[PDB]
């Protein structure tokens, strides 16, 4: 199998197996995508699949400033321009529907409220916020409040609404953000979940929320338009799990029964070493994939983290993964697909302009000529 040949992710047809990883850019004031955002995504429409920047299902699900959401009518309209543009350019695009859980700040929350989480354990993490009087970071994340059962029901409804909004905005589907220490992972992992009810303790209980979210979203828009991002060992956002194999194998055994479009896996620490581990034992990614496949899982297996041209080509050729998502290389290379096809040089990413600001370091990375 070639990295450059078409693929299928549930109901979504992909032109090739090069995926644009979700990348928060903080360039949508008021949680509403704008014209510059449309330019940015259109530039990258040769990707087999674009996964958007995390896009929250609600204001409660926001953790950073100037992030586009799916909860305002104006935001849905803004996204529609983006998906239309991507489609006209021959692309496909899914919304990474997001809830940050404890990773937020009161100034971003409705009513100036506490971020919500499975347990009231403050993260030692930071959020991108815009100084009331200029301008940009940093505050420690706020103390979170433990979710009640009723609160959880309200969030599930927000996931239904968000998935519905994604379809209204013309997305081809959604990727449920269940990675990088955010709300769903906060329930999954032991360091963040000290609940004594049906959502805490056992692996089955800790995965309960993830599976309810998946089932709610899949019921709303169709399993064949539903994917999910997972990150078994990442230390992102102050999270820790000492025994991820049984937990994550169980998760994908369950996902394997649900006819999903794709599973997107962050292999290692997000943006860090691929061989990262937290517990005593290394994570076995082959065993993890096997647990999905052996349960009947037929979703496209999209892998991420530290890939380059050669490792991506090799991983797809061997069948270890079905497709590869690139993060930082897509920031810097709108025509990454053509560059990789021709084995051309790449532009280097400029980290200082990843978050916030303007067109510089966003829409001005050049494509190659002709
Ligand atoms: C600027 C930036 C923003 C990111 N925002 C998100 C995000 O919104 N959602 C997500 O799941 N991962 C996010 N990540 C992680 C990337 O999707 C990806 O996992 C990471 O960059 C590693 O892949 P790479 O080695 O190809 O860059 C972000 C990464 C970067 C560099």
Numbering used by the authors: 2 to 371
Reproduce passages from the article.
We determined the crystal structure of the enzyme NerA, which has been shown to exhibit dual ene-reductase and nitro-reductase activity with α,β-unsaturated nitro compounds, from A. radiobacter. NerA exhibits a TIM-barrel fold typical for OYE-like proteins, and all catalytically important active site residues are conserved. The putative proton donor residue is Y183.
Three enzyme molecules were present in the asymmetric unit, and the final model could be refined to R and Rfree values of 15.8 and 18.9 %, respectively. Structural superposition of the three monomers in the asymmetric unit gave very low RMSD values (Cα-RMSD for 371 aligned residues) of 0.160 Å for the superposition of chain A and chain B, 0.097 Å for that of chain A and chain C, and 0.216 Å for that of chain B and chain C. Larger structural differences are found in the regions of loop β3. In contrast, loop β3 in NerA is very long and forms a small subdomain. Similarly to these two structures, NerA exhibits the highest crystallographic B factors in this capping subdomain. In the case of NerA, these residues are Y65 and Y356, and the geometric centers of their phenyl rings are 7.8 Å apart from each other. This distance places NerA in the “intermediate distance cluster” of OYEs. The experimentally determined moderate stereoselectivity of NerA with 1-nitro-2-phenylpropene (54 % ee for the reduced S-configured product)34 is in line with this prediction. For NerA we found that the biggest part of its active site is hydrophilic, with only a small hydrophobic patch located between the residues Y65 and Y356.
